[PDB]
Design an enzyme around this catalytic site. Structure first.
Site, PDB file in Angstrom:
ATOM      1  N   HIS A  36      65.525  49.871 -84.777  1.00 27.30           N
ATOM      2  CA  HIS A  36      66.127  50.730 -83.745  1.00 27.30           C
ATOM      3  C   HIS A  36      67.385  50.180 -83.088  1.00 27.30           C
ATOM      4  O   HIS A  36      68.195  50.941 -82.592  1.00 27.30           O
ATOM      5  CB  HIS A  36      65.105  51.108 -82.667  1.00 27.30           C
ATOM      6  CG  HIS A  36      64.949  50.088 -81.582  1.00 27.30           C
ATOM      7  ND1 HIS A  36      64.370  48.858 -81.791  1.00 27.30           N
ATOM      8  CD2 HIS A  36      65.273  50.130 -80.270  1.00 27.30           C
ATOM      9  CE1 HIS A  36      64.347  48.184 -80.657  1.00 27.30           C
ATOM     10  NE2 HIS A  36      64.890  48.934 -79.718  1.00 27.30           N
ATOM     11  N   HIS A  56      70.639  51.179 -79.487  1.00 26.96           N
ATOM     12  CA  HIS A  56      71.503  50.141 -78.909  1.00 26.96           C
ATOM     13  C   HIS A  56      72.871  50.079 -79.596  1.00 26.96           C
ATOM     14  O   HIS A  56      73.488  49.016 -79.689  1.00 26.96           O
ATOM     15  CB  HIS A  56      70.800  48.786 -78.898  1.00 26.96           C
ATOM     16  CG  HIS A  56      69.435  48.835 -78.298  1.00 26.96           C
ATOM     17  ND1 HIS A  56      69.211  49.227 -76.999  1.00 26.96           N
ATOM     18  CD2 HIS A  56      68.217  48.576 -78.827  1.00 26.96           C
ATOM     19  CE1 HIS A  56      67.916  49.189 -76.748  1.00 26.96           C
ATOM     20  NE2 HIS A  56      67.289  48.801 -77.842  1.00 26.96           N
ATOM     21  N   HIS A  91      35.508  44.815 -41.421  1.00 25.42           N
ATOM     22  CA  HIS A  91      34.472  44.243 -40.548  1.00 25.42           C
ATOM     23  C   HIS A  91      34.663  42.756 -40.198  1.00 25.42           C
ATOM     24  O   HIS A  91      34.212  42.294 -39.142  1.00 25.42           O
ATOM     25  CB  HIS A  91      33.076  44.511 -41.112  1.00 25.42           C
ATOM     26  CG  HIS A  91      32.779  45.963 -41.305  1.00 25.42           C
ATOM     27  ND1 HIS A  91      33.006  46.611 -42.495  1.00 25.42           N
ATOM     28  CD2 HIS A  91      32.295  46.899 -40.456  1.00 25.42           C
ATOM     29  CE1 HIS A  91      32.660  47.880 -42.380  1.00 25.42           C
ATOM     30  NE2 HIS A  91      32.224  48.082 -41.150  1.00 25.42           N
ATOM     31  N   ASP A 106      59.905  46.545 -84.099  1.00 24.98           N
ATOM     32  CA  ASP A 106      61.003  47.500 -84.176  1.00 24.98           C
ATOM     33  C   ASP A 106      62.323  46.823 -83.904  1.00 24.98           C
ATOM     34  O   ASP A 106      62.755  46.732 -82.755  1.00 24.98           O
ATOM     35  CB  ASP A 106      60.786  48.691 -83.234  1.00 24.98           C
ATOM     36  CG  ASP A 106      61.257  50.003 -83.826  1.00 24.98           C
ATOM     37  OD1 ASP A 106      62.473  50.152 -84.033  1.00 24.98           O
ATOM     38  OD2 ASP A 106      60.481  50.939 -84.122  1.00 24.98           O
ATOM     39  N   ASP A 158      66.131  52.146 -74.055  1.00 24.55           N
ATOM     40  CA  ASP A 158      64.758  52.120 -74.536  1.00 24.55           C
ATOM     41  C   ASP A 158      63.867  52.975 -73.636  1.00 24.55           C
ATOM     42  O   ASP A 158      63.068  53.735 -74.115  1.00 24.55           O
ATOM     43  CB  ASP A 158      64.246  50.692 -74.597  1.00 24.55           C
ATOM     44  CG  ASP A 158      64.861  49.888 -75.733  1.00 24.55           C
ATOM     45  OD1 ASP A 158      65.208  50.446 -76.789  1.00 24.55           O
ATOM     46  OD2 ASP A 158      64.995  48.655 -75.681  1.00 24.55           O
TER      47      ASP A 158
HETATM   48  C1  LIG Z   1      67.018  42.556 -80.448  1.00 24.88           C
HETATM   49  C2  LIG Z   1      66.577  42.540 -81.777  1.00 24.88           C
HETATM   50  C3  LIG Z   1      65.323  43.040 -82.161  1.00 24.88           C
HETATM   51  C4  LIG Z   1      64.473  43.581 -81.151  1.00 24.88           C
HETATM   52  N1  LIG Z   1      63.263  44.124 -81.244  1.00 24.88           N
HETATM   53  C5  LIG Z   1      62.914  44.460 -79.957  1.00 24.88           C
HETATM   54  C6  LIG Z   1      63.923  44.150 -79.020  1.00 24.88           C
HETATM   55  C7  LIG Z   1      64.914  43.592 -79.792  1.00 24.88           C
HETATM   56  C8  LIG Z   1      66.202  43.067 -79.434  1.00 24.88           C
HETATM   57  S1  FES Z   2      34.073  43.451 -43.948  1.00 33.19           S
HETATM   58 FE1  FES Z   2      33.333  45.525 -44.061  1.00 33.19          FE
HETATM   59  S2  FES Z   2      34.121  46.263 -45.979  1.00 33.19           S
HETATM   60 FE2  FES Z   2      34.837  44.175 -45.844  1.00 33.19          FE
HETATM   61 FE   LIG Z   3      65.475  48.040 -77.746  1.00 29.69          FE
END
Ligand SMILES: c1ccc2[nH]ccc2c1
Ligand code: FES
Ligand SMILES: [Fe+3]
Ligand SMILES: c1ccc2[nH]ccc2c1
Ligand SMILES: c1ccc2[nH]ccc2c1
Ligand code: FES
Ligand code: FES
Ligand SMILES: [Fe+3]
Ligand SMILES: [Fe+3]
Lengths: 165, 440, 440, 165, 165, 440
Positions: B216, B221, B111, B213, B372
């Site tokens: 892992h 990795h 509008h 973590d 990952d």
């Molecule tokens: C390297 C070492 C530890 C990590 N934890 C999450 C990513 C990551 C990369």
């Molecule tokens: S001007 Fe009408 S909904 Fe925004």
């Molecule tokens: Fe990772």
């Protein structure tokens, strides 16, 4: 150009044929020691604004060493992102060959539609983009000096970019 | 609406998270868990939005989210930080359809109601003609994000107006956020824009991964361990520390083995370790002197990564900072928003080198983070059937060995190694506490 | 959690399935019916998974499902058949991401927990370093499929540990499964792998089709009647039999007209009719002597097809066996997993000829099944609106004519023709009984 | 090759033009009396493993008689799977022509993206695959001796394979 | 034809390159004063029935004046349907060039797969159709006399047809 | 099933729609609202299906919907208008899979049950063989659309058999439908077929737009104001009228300024204004003499558009009629079915010119409607989060100025301008009344 069109076009199909076959190491025999493989970030902006493409940041920005690592990683037997491998199809269309900044270099623009599938689940991914390459001459074929994959998305619709485009 | 079955399994879990050291698996991929989580967690907790350096000048805005809610986060023409809801007051149209930009005003396309970036409705087309001046503008301004506050750059937002201040909410974590954000005079900067992509994995799995973590690193990795981009020593995390706070937060600090010499601080430029020695508590500097990896999450879905890593298999490691949002799209879907930050006054050479260490390791196409995203997306798949949601996630690492560090010189509950899951258990405990909370 | 409206319409149906001979149409495309069906039917019933000949040697595995639950079905290094859940005990990752293969061990990619194909956790990385040997491995083995049993090759699985043994569950059907599975010494074999594809149709519609729908052959497979691939006589099913058991099972046998001469047994190789004459009950052989089509379902979603049919419009018919799963993906979606089985000791010529009769008629690209998939997918579409779910499916074929066969020489309730729908009504009756069962 | 490329490429577009137009009988004038049209099954396996493709079993395995039945079926007026017909588009891209095992035979590889739609519902199906053909010479044009449509999927994302690819 | 194939094909790629770049005004320099750009409506009918295509009604039926309006609208700074612009990719495949009703006219048939995306949301649209063009000669290039975009859909899968195909 | 929260916010809204002049925003994009809406609104209200001129001769049919329910709307061989449900009585298959056509009979592909276009089952294959003549055909005819009636061409349908006759339901609106439908002797005609496309926007937003939103013409259709295709005067709606009825209906008439001369009637052909002067009430003709835009909705989701507009930036305006359905596909999806009608006896030149004024302005590729589809689709997006559904839509235009017209010569509640939102509020009031109705 002609016949250089027939030869660049068939290069781009052979490159795709290597990529969809998982032969990344063989693909690395293409590419040049000063390779630049970049996948820019895009953001929604208005028509008015100067540009769409983010400067300073990228989805993928490889030189030849970094690209060799990327293939090296996949040659290891603990590359979980692709170790039951994807099914990809690189659909190279709209090839436009045009002379380069130097002699024996050609600016090679293609449309890509990458189709990705990952193991038994009933879903698929589709990346659509436009690659703007620079193919150098090397012998009786070509070598890739540079690629810019500009995708038609701002929020990328795949869980990772583990496939070369 | 918590159902009767979910309440019972949340309660059983709250019991098992401290006793058996497991957690009910039904919490990962449930449509019911997700809807309750929308109000209980994301409808109250402090969710990250933008970094102040994304919006430096007046008018600069970014469009960010708390779950499905779209918020313009911008710097209005008076200089202050605003978080407007991105829905017109008239009929609820997007007043802004870009994701980034710079504008003084926000003209709604439907509008025409024009808003300042300040929030207040300044102009209604046909004021006399349609409304006959009987329209009071002041009552129809872009809904302010209930709670809005920044911490050393980090613009967090909350949907609950009766919630703890952002400083109280971060609490003792502030000590550790500081060693990552407060290192230099000019501040940190977000470079370019975040990478935004869609993983088909429940958000908590990424959030779980960063809290503590490091275990892992060696299987998932393993590819990177072979190339020399990840620590080759199977007990590399043992030279580390396992800190957590209340409110579900928690982090993990890893340094190098006693022999192995790595530059003091992550090898950060000469000019910024000079600034960090005086900007941070004398204790904070000593924690940061040997460190090589810092990984944590600031509860809901923001994760920090300060990793000393290589840009390829032939380059020496250089440090990088990354903040990332695990944005929840559904029970089995998230959208990663991975930021990359670097100190403003850092040399261009280091700014460029630090960015290539981030890119080639983490983010959408990283050699680390792409594995990952494959692990998270597969956990979510299988954790979506009924017989699986019956089972339990095992968080028993250290059971009958975890002795809090008497020698630790920072706040929170610390353990003197990084192979532990006490961070992840605490993260889920607060998750569950907030879930059951009938009254906030 | 079986709403008040669904309970009422299920009960009204259980009344109508034996009296009016109709069934409520709301049972085909309902999100509510589907979720209740997940626990009530697929959470208790005996669902098919693999055939033992898919996994002959030690290590061979296939990844198969009960609804959303993914299970490794394999032959462990001791020789026995195992059905592990495909979710790690640690954080619930897919321990196996292929669909088929051969492996001794299953190393989980996330943290490294190695499992034998036997099920038991053999190796935890950083046993001393992380867990300090305080991790008991024996308590963290791949969840065994609650109930696991094979019948003459057919590996069925059930999620309910307090359910009838597979032999008792098949019951009197075992008599008819035998004439299809127990014909030769070496056994049946699954050739290659199943065709797996996605139809947008509720699973019960395919399951309903095989139990006793020979009536449809003439309109839907009219294309094939014109080419001489389907029986041209409009009363071809009248020379047949309509058998069913308890537990919802049921089948249908059709042989040729009194005049029309077709080889004794489906024309199966000289060397296997010699073996089938002695392997099967003297009565079973006489039921199988004239037969030309056997079509049935083993309750939930497994269907058998033993059809004498041609590979093209110019070839004489040759017999083929097919087992198929109507895997439920959602209310309006299934995944067909269509298997093709042949006797191991059958000649290569017959193995090849039998396979081409299957391919060209049934399966993904068949001339028969492709029309079946179009009908099921269109029933589901229209049966998904509220006014349609109000109506009822008509199962009135034979009302006031169906007299059980006094001369039938096999178990179960038989009728002396194949134009009947008493098989389909019984199938839905058991379906409904299981649905309402507050206690299993 | 050249000019044989121009001729095989335009054959493959004319073949696609006949298929998307529903003219299957006219398409059957192509194909050879020893035709083999096969669509292999695929399963997720690891990179290590010898192959992806299932042996012994197929989605479609036609010779000329069986293929004639398939067209014969659709010429009848009770072919419900296609009697309100699909809307299909065969997107033939990445055409790679290479010399055959014999003279006058050519191994013709294309990428296919089949787009399928079925009557008024707001959904579509996409099959992606790579056809490996063998085109024989017959007169001043070609005839198809063999095709192998290898799709990029294990679980097929269509309710049936009632369209020729 | 030949070489006229190489030239019409590269015209259709340049036309697509202009359209995906948002240069609609530059695209209007192609097209002819008696242009007819039509996008017919389709309905599911049986094989028997004479035709699929609805007569008398259309999705888009432009002449050169009306088409100039459509570009004129987008050059204004209040074209909300495209003012944060779409990301589109025009995938021109299966190009078939054939001689026209007159001399220097060619009936140019392509397959289009339009990929459309709109700002940050994780969804995409895909239009699939077949364009039947008539390219006139004008100088050392061509001009478009007519186009018929016949899409493979009855219910169109985009919220509007704000993109030229 | 209304839940407790939705009931309360519906009641709070019913209170605010007449007092504060706002409406709760939670009513646009809710999965709960949508399911309740399926029964409460579309399960009772009178929904439009087809126009009688789409099916002129005997056998002609179109396939149309009420929500998910698919109905064949046809002219049976006796001449009458029928609305059959498109689901076989046997197993519920689509008896017709086209969207348009002409057929005498409807043979169901599954088993062969042939139906007349009359509705009654005429032939069951294997009557003697299968059913033994014991099948009574008369009881198994295509379920008739509970309530079926046409108004001056407009074939409406309703799922509720105990609902008001279509004439009573339209009520006082009939007066205004007439000035649009009853202008000529031969009647109106639907040209070709409707454009059918999918917008990702909740249906009510389009319906809300046509009832009485002329206010928006200036900002959203600003592009068209610049080209001279929209009225350039910012108070062009002020020369208009804001009528509404009970049952949620309502429309809006706009004529030209006192000075500005536009042909009497919309410039309709000489031969049809002669026919309209005698066919309509002497009052009706006077309301229609100056008018240039008529925009309204016939409650649920049918909208009328009679706009005098140009086919391009260089052509003089010519009049066009358009009926359109906002078909609801889900909470955040609709399918527009936009028809274009023209008087049968109108000259070909005007038929052609009227059609090009419709095309280039409204419909799928219109310069006007393509911006409407962008606005609706964006409102829906942002109105799908929890903090947004908390807010409210503002309908306060005219608060303390709206005085009913004493000089208005037609029924219903009229106001003497078009810049008002009392139509839209009434539309939502009936919407809410139907929503809460425990008994219809
Ligand atoms: C390297 C070492 C530890 C990590 N934890 C999450 C990513 C990551 C990369
Ligand atoms: S001007 Fe009408 S909904 Fe925004
Ligand atoms: Fe990772
Ligand atoms: C031939 C005859 C009867 C049948 N019932 C199900 C499939 C089938 C094939
Ligand atoms: C012109 C004038 C007023 C209107 N209300 C809705 C559409 C429309 C067009
Ligand atoms: S999730 Fe399997 S090893 Fe941790
Ligand atoms: S479902 Fe229609 S004939 Fe059986
Ligand atoms: Fe069948
Ligand atoms: Fe409008």
């Amino acid at each position: 150009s002609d016949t250089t069109v027939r030869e660049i076009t068939e290069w781009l199909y052979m490159e795709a044929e290597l990529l969809d076959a998982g032969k990344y190491r063989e693909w690395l025999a293409l590419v040049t020691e000063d390779l630049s493989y970049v996948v820019p970030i895009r953001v929604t902006r208005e028509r008015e604004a100067v540009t769409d493409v983010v400067e300073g940041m990228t989805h993928m920005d490889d030189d030849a060493d970094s690209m060799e690592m990327r293939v090296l990683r996949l040659e290891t037997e603990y590359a979980w992102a692709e170790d039951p491998p994807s099914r990809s199809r690189h659909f190279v269309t709209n090839v436009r060959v045009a002379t380069g900044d130097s002699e024996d270099e050609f600016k090679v623009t293609s449309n890509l539609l990458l189709y990705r599938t990952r193991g038994d689940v009933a879903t698929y991914d589709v990346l659509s983009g436009e690659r703007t390459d620079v193919l150098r001459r090397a012998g009786d074929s070509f070598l890739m000096a540079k690629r810019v994959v500009l995708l038609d998305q701002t929020t990328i619709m795949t869980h990772n970019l583990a496939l070369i485009m | 609406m918590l159902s009767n079955e979910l309440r019972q399994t949340l309660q059983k879990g709250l019991h098992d998270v401290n006793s058996d050291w497991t957690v009910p698996a039904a919490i990962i991929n449930d449509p019911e868990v997700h809807d309750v989580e929308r109000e209980r967690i994301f409808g109250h907790a402090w969710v990250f939005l933008a970094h102040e350096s994304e919006i430096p000048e007046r008018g600069d805005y970014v469009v960010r989210y708390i779950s499905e809610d779209q918020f313009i986060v911008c710097r209005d023409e008076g200089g202050e930080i605003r978080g407007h809801l991105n829905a017109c007051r008239h009929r609820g149209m997007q007043v802004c359809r870009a994701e980034m930009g710079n504008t003084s005003h926000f003209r709604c396309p439907y509008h025409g109601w024009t808003y300042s970036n300040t929030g207040s409705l300044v102009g209604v087309p046909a004021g006399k003609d349609a409304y006959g001046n009987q329209l009071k503008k002041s009552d129809w301004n872009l809904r302010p994000m209930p709670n809005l506050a920044s911490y050393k750059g980090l613009i967090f937002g909350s949907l609950d107006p009766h919630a703890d201040s952002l400083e109280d909410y971060l609490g003792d974590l502030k000590f550790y956020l500081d060693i990552v954000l407060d290192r230099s005079d000019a501040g940190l900067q977000v470079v370019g824009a975040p990478q935004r992509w869609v993983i088909d994995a429940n958000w908590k799995l990424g959030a779980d991964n960063f809290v503590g973590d490091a275990y892992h690193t060696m299987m998932t990795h393993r590819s990177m361990v072979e190339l020399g981009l990840a620590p080759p020593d199977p007990q590399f995390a043992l030279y580390g520390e396992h800190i957590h706070t209340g409110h579900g937060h928690g982090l993990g600090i890893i340094g190098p083995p006693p022999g192995m010499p790595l530059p003091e601080f992550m090898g950060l430029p000469e000019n910024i370790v000079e600034e960090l020695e005086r900007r941070l508590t004398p204790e904070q500097v000593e924690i940061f002197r040997p460190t090589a990896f810092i990984h944590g999450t600031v509860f809901p879905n923001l994760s920090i990564g300060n990793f000393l890593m290589g840009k390829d298999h032939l380059s020496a490691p250089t440090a990088f900072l990354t903040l990332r949002l695990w944005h929840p799209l559904g029970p089995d879907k998230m959208e990663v928003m991975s930021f990359f930050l670097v100190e403003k006054d850092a040399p261009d050479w280091f700014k460029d080198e630090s960015y290539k260490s981030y890119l080639r390791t983490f983010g959408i196409s990283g050699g680390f983070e792409q594995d990952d995203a494959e692990n998270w997306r597969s956990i979510t798949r299988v954790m979506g059937g009924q017989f699986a949601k019956t089972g339990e996630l095992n968080y028993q690492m250290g059971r009958g060995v975890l002795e809090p560090d008497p020698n630790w010189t920072g706040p929170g509950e610390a353990y003197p190694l990084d192979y532990a899951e006490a961070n992840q258990r605490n993260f889920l405990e607060y998750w569950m506490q907030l879930m059951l909370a009938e009254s906030p």
